[PDB]
Amino acid sequence: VEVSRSDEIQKARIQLPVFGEEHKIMEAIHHNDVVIICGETGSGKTTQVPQFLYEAGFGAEDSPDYPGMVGITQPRRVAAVSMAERVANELGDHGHKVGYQIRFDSTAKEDTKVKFMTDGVLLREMMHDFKLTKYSSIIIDEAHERNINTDILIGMLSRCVRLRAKLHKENPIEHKKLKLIIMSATLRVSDFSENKTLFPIAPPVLQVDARQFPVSIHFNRRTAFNYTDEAFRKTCKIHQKLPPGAILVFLTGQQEITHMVKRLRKEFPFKKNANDPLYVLPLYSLLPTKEQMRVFQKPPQGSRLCIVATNVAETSLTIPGVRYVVDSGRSKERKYNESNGVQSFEVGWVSKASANQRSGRAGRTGPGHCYRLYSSAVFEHDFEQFSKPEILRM
RNA sequence: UUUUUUUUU
């Protein structure tokens, strides 16, 4: 199968170190019933999978009615949409042959081989069905967050695939076996691979690296009673001491963030061409789009960037021209008193996965200086390494 | 005597 590619996007095909590993994906699409592949983002996994499975012999495997076509599920609607104006142009075919579906935009075209999903739309489709005949190649995204809907869907697809791992008809050879790879976002999914519950077999796994684009991890053995002022001091020390760039100041809630915005408008009130060139912007997804496009833009000249954000920045929104974080130390979380029906908004330990993703959010392609207001001994006491499931709270 | 970071149909 050929793709009708383009020049700069063939530059985007070869550059990824997973396309040369295509044969593994080939055996992963030909040998194993369920495959688990992990890796940090930016290593060319979602931006390389449609070129795998459009060229795998699965677009027309069980042809001529097209029941072999890949659905790749995404954490959220904007991830699928942005990735569709990213890599549906990577396969050189129009919107009929590559597409997406989100909560309120359905692009159900019959020519399609690659479809980017959320969780809920595919739930909608296979409570509308139960045996998943129209699909044969499925790729999962974000296996490390372990949300509600990802876990729900993976349990019920384990049921459906292991029901179709059996014989389709009265002992045929034409089985509607479903080929599925979980393209993870961070490199610990083995907490599910050890179990014999969701699959009694051990699911075969593949581990791939990424491009670090280095970040310097720095621990401050400091009291973290008012982590706002500590983050303020670390970002002032980077802004004055270290070479220029952009620095991230991270917090938890609604009020400390605008308090830090007021302060960085106070001690650095100039923002035009105390000659510290600085533009300071808050960020969380409870802000309107005009401020959300204000951070999409680059800083005005005579001013660097500095972003006072909550814990949104790890996964929700990420911006190009930043270098360094000062972490939250402790992040805001929510839990329910099941003995009462009492909810809660509180602040507790950042797990090491969220902090690592945060440090990666700092050093996109440039140097990172992860000035952590907490210590290594406090990073010793940020167990567990990964975050706890979002199921257990609600 | 308001104290909502976050999310999937």
From Swiss-Prot:
ATP binds at G39, E40, T41, G42, S43, G44, K45, T46. Residues 274-394 form the Helicase C-terminal domain. Residues 26-205 form the Helicase ATP-binding domain. The chain holds residues 376 to 845 of 1267 of the full protein. Interacts with snoRNA U3. Component of the ribosomal small subunit (SSU) processome composed of at least 40 protein subunits and snoRNA U3. It is found in: Nucleus, Nucleolus. It comes from the Eukaryota. Probable ATP-binding RNA helicase. Required for 18S rRNA synthesis. May play a role in restructuring of the pre-rRNA. Belongs to the DEAD box helicase family. DEAH subfamily. A motif (DEAH box) lies at residues 141-144. Present with 2000 molecules/cell in log phase SD medium. This is Probable ATP-dependent RNA helicase DHR1. It comes from Saccharomyces cerevisiae (strain ATCC 204508 / S288c) (Baker's yeast).
